[PDB]
CSV table of all heavy atoms in Angstrom, one decimal:
chain,number,residue,atom,x,y,z
B,353,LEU,N,55.4,46.3,73.9
B,353,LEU,CA,54.0,46.2,73.6
B,353,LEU,C,53.2,45.4,74.7
B,353,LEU,O,52.1,45.8,75.0
B,353,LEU,CB,53.7,45.5,72.2
B,353,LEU,CG,52.3,45.2,71.8
B,353,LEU,CD1,51.4,46.4,71.9
B,353,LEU,CD2,52.3,44.6,70.4
B,367,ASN,N,48.9,51.5,68.8
B,367,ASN,CA,49.0,51.2,67.4
B,367,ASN,C,50.3,51.4,66.8
B,367,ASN,O,50.8,50.6,65.9
B,367,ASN,CB,47.9,52.0,66.6
B,367,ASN,CG,46.5,51.5,66.9
B,367,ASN,OD1,46.3,50.4,67.4
B,367,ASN,ND2,45.5,52.4,66.6
B,370,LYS,N,52.4,48.5,67.7
B,370,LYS,CA,52.1,47.3,66.9
B,370,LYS,C,52.7,47.4,65.5
B,370,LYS,O,53.2,46.4,64.9
B,370,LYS,CB,50.6,47.1,66.8
B,370,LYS,CG,50.0,46.5,68.0
B,370,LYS,CD,48.5,46.6,68.1
B,370,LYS,CE,47.9,45.9,69.3
B,370,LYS,NZ,46.4,46.2,69.4
B,371,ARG,N,52.6,48.6,64.9
B,371,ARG,CA,53.2,48.8,63.6
B,371,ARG,C,54.7,48.6,63.6
B,371,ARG,O,55.3,48.0,62.7
B,371,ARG,CB,52.9,50.2,63.1
B,371,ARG,CG,53.7,50.7,61.9
B,371,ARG,CD,53.2,51.9,61.2
B,371,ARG,NE,53.8,52.2,59.9
B,371,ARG,CZ,53.4,53.0,59.0
B,371,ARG,NH1,52.3,53.7,59.2
B,371,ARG,NH2,54.1,53.2,57.9
B,373,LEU,N,56.3,46.6,65.6
B,373,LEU,CA,56.5,45.2,65.8
B,373,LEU,C,56.4,44.5,64.4
B,373,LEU,O,57.2,43.6,64.1
B,373,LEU,CB,55.6,44.6,66.8
B,373,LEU,CG,55.5,43.1,66.9
B,373,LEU,CD1,56.8,42.5,67.2
B,373,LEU,CD2,54.5,42.7,68.0
B,374,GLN,N,55.4,44.8,63.7
B,374,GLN,CA,55.2,44.2,62.4
B,374,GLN,C,56.4,44.5,61.4
B,374,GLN,O,56.9,43.7,60.7
B,374,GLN,CB,53.9,44.6,61.7
B,374,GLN,CG,52.7,44.1,62.4
B,374,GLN,CD,51.4,44.5,61.7
B,374,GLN,OE1,51.4,45.3,60.8
B,374,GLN,NE2,50.2,44.1,62.2
B,375,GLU,N,56.8,45.8,61.5
B,375,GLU,CA,58.0,46.2,60.6
B,375,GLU,C,59.2,45.5,61.1
B,375,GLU,O,60.1,45.1,60.2
B,375,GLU,CB,58.1,47.7,60.7
B,375,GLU,CG,57.1,48.5,59.9
B,375,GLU,CD,57.4,49.9,59.7
B,375,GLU,OE1,58.5,50.4,60.3
B,375,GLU,OE2,56.7,50.6,59.0
B,377,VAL,N,59.4,42.4,62.5
B,377,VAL,CA,59.3,41.0,62.0
B,377,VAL,C,59.6,41.0,60.5
B,377,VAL,O,60.3,40.1,60.0
B,377,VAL,CB,58.0,40.4,62.3
B,377,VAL,CG1,57.9,39.0,61.7
B,377,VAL,CG2,57.8,40.3,63.8
B,378,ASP,N,59.0,42.0,59.7
B,378,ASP,CA,59.2,42.0,58.3
B,378,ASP,C,60.7,42.2,58.0
B,378,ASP,O,61.2,41.6,57.0
B,378,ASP,CB,58.4,43.1,57.7
B,378,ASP,CG,56.9,42.9,57.8
B,378,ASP,OD1,56.5,42.0,58.5
B,378,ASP,OD2,56.1,43.6,57.1
B,381,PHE,N,62.5,38.8,58.5
B,381,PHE,CA,62.4,37.8,57.4
B,381,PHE,C,63.0,38.3,56.1
B,381,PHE,O,63.9,37.7,55.6
B,381,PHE,CB,60.9,37.5,57.2
B,381,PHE,CG,60.3,36.6,58.3
B,381,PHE,CD1,59.0,36.8,58.6
B,381,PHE,CD2,61.0,35.6,58.9
B,381,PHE,CE1,58.4,36.0,59.6
B,381,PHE,CE2,60.4,34.8,59.9
B,381,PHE,CZ,59.1,35.0,60.3
B,382,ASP,N,62.5,39.4,55.6
B,382,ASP,CA,63.0,39.9,54.3
B,382,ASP,C,63.3,41.4,54.5
B,382,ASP,O,62.4,42.2,54.8
B,382,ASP,CB,62.0,39.7,53.2
B,382,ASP,CG,62.7,39.4,51.8
B,382,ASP,OD1,63.8,40.0,51.6
B,382,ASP,OD2,62.2,38.7,51.0
B,385,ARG,N,62.7,44.7,51.3
B,385,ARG,CA,61.6,44.4,50.3
B,385,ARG,C,60.6,45.5,50.4
B,385,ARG,O,60.1,46.0,49.3
B,385,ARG,CB,61.0,43.1,50.7
B,385,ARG,CG,60.3,42.4,49.5
B,385,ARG,CD,60.1,40.9,49.8
B,385,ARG,NE,59.4,40.2,48.7
B,385,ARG,CZ,59.3,38.9,48.6
B,385,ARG,NH1,59.7,38.1,49.5
B,385,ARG,NH2,58.6,38.4,47.5
C,99,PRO,N,49.2,39.5,66.5
C,99,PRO,CA,49.5,38.8,65.2
C,99,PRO,C,50.2,39.7,64.2
C,99,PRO,O,50.0,40.9,64.2
C,99,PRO,CB,48.1,38.3,64.7
C,99,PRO,CG,47.2,38.4,65.9
C,99,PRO,CD,47.7,39.5,66.7
C,100,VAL,N,51.0,39.1,63.4
C,100,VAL,CA,51.8,39.8,62.3
C,100,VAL,C,51.6,38.9,61.1
C,100,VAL,O,51.4,37.7,61.1
C,100,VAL,CB,53.2,40.0,62.7
C,100,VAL,CG1,53.3,40.8,64.0
C,100,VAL,CG2,54.0,38.7,62.7
C,101,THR,N,51.9,39.6,59.9
C,101,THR,CA,51.8,38.9,58.6
C,101,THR,C,53.2,38.5,58.2
C,101,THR,O,54.2,39.0,58.6
C,101,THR,CB,51.2,39.9,57.6
C,101,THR,OG1,51.8,41.1,57.6
C,101,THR,CG2,49.7,40.1,57.9
C,102,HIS,N,53.1,37.5,57.2
C,102,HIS,CA,54.4,37.1,56.6
C,102,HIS,C,54.6,37.9,55.3
C,102,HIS,O,53.7,38.0,54.5
C,102,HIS,CB,54.2,35.6,56.3
C,102,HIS,CG,55.6,34.9,56.1
C,102,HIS,ND1,56.6,35.4,55.4
C,102,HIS,CD2,56.0,33.7,56.6
C,102,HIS,CE1,57.6,34.6,55.5
C,102,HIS,NE2,57.3,33.5,56.1
C,103,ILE,N,55.8,38.5,55.3
C,103,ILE,CA,56.1,39.4,54.2
C,103,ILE,C,56.1,38.7,52.8
C,103,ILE,O,55.7,39.3,51.8
C,103,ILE,CB,57.4,40.1,54.4
C,103,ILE,CG1,57.6,41.3,53.4
C,103,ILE,CG2,58.6,39.1,54.3
C,103,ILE,CD1,56.7,42.5,53.7
C,104,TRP,N,56.4,37.4,52.8
C,104,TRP,CA,56.5,36.7,51.5
C,104,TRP,C,55.1,36.6,50.9
C,104,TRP,O,55.0,36.8,49.6
C,104,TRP,CB,57.0,35.3,51.7
C,104,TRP,CG,58.5,35.3,51.8
C,104,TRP,CD1,59.4,36.3,52.0
C,104,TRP,CD2,59.4,34.1,51.6
C,104,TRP,NE1,60.7,35.9,52.0
C,104,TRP,CE2,60.7,34.5,51.8
C,104,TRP,CE3,59.1,32.8,51.4
C,104,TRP,CZ2,61.8,33.6,51.7
C,104,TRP,CZ3,60.2,31.9,51.2
C,104,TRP,CH2,61.5,32.3,51.4
C,107,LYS,N,53.9,40.8,50.1
C,107,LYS,CA,54.5,41.8,49.2
C,107,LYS,C,54.8,41.3,47.8
C,107,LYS,O,54.6,41.9,46.8
C,107,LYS,CB,55.8,42.3,49.9
C,107,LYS,CG,56.5,43.5,49.2
C,107,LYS,CD,55.6,44.7,49.2
C,107,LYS,CE,56.4,45.9,48.7
C,107,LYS,NZ,55.5,47.2,48.7
C,108,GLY,N,55.3,40.0,47.8
C,108,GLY,CA,55.8,39.5,46.5
C,108,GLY,C,54.7,39.5,45.4
C,108,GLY,O,53.6,39.1,45.7
C,128,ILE,N,47.0,46.6,56.9
C,128,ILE,CA,47.9,45.9,57.8
C,128,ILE,C,48.7,46.8,58.6
C,128,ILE,O,49.1,46.6,59.8
C,128,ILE,CB,48.7,44.8,57.1
C,128,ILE,CG1,49.8,45.4,56.3
C,128,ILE,CG2,47.8,43.9,56.2
C,128,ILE,CD1,50.6,44.4,55.5
C,129,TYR,N,49.1,48.0,58.0
C,129,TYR,CA,50.0,48.9,58.6
C,129,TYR,C,49.3,50.0,59.3
C,129,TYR,O,49.8,51.2,59.4
C,129,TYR,CB,51.0,49.5,57.6
C,129,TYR,CG,52.1,48.6,57.2
C,129,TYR,CD1,52.2,48.0,56.0
C,129,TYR,CD2,53.1,48.3,58.2
C,129,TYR,CE1,53.3,47.1,55.7
C,129,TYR,CE2,54.2,47.5,57.9
C,129,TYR,CZ,54.2,46.9,56.7
C,129,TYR,OH,55.3,46.0,56.4
C,130,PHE,N,48.1,49.8,59.8
C,130,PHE,CA,47.3,50.6,60.7
C,130,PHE,C,47.1,52.0,60.1
C,130,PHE,O,47.6,53.0,60.6
C,130,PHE,CB,48.0,50.7,62.1
C,130,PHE,CG,48.1,49.4,62.8
C,130,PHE,CD1,49.1,48.5,62.5
C,130,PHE,CD2,47.1,49.1,63.7
C,130,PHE,CE1,49.1,47.3,63.2
C,130,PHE,CE2,47.1,47.9,64.4
C,130,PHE,CZ,48.1,47.0,64.2
C,257,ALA,N,46.8,43.2,61.2
C,257,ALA,CA,46.8,41.8,60.9
C,257,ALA,C,45.7,41.0,61.6
C,257,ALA,O,45.3,39.9,61.1
C,257,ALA,CB,48.2,41.1,61.2
Side-chain angles (χ1 to χ4, degrees):
Chain B
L353 175 51
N367 287 346
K370 281 168 176 168
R371 166 165 189 168
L373 169 57
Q374 293 179 356
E375 289 192 351
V377 175
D378 294 13
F381 286 145
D382 216 328
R385 205 163 179 169
Chain C
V100 306
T101 52
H102 203 317
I103 190 71
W104 279 18
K107 189 65 172 182
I128 75 181
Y129 282 110
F130 295 85

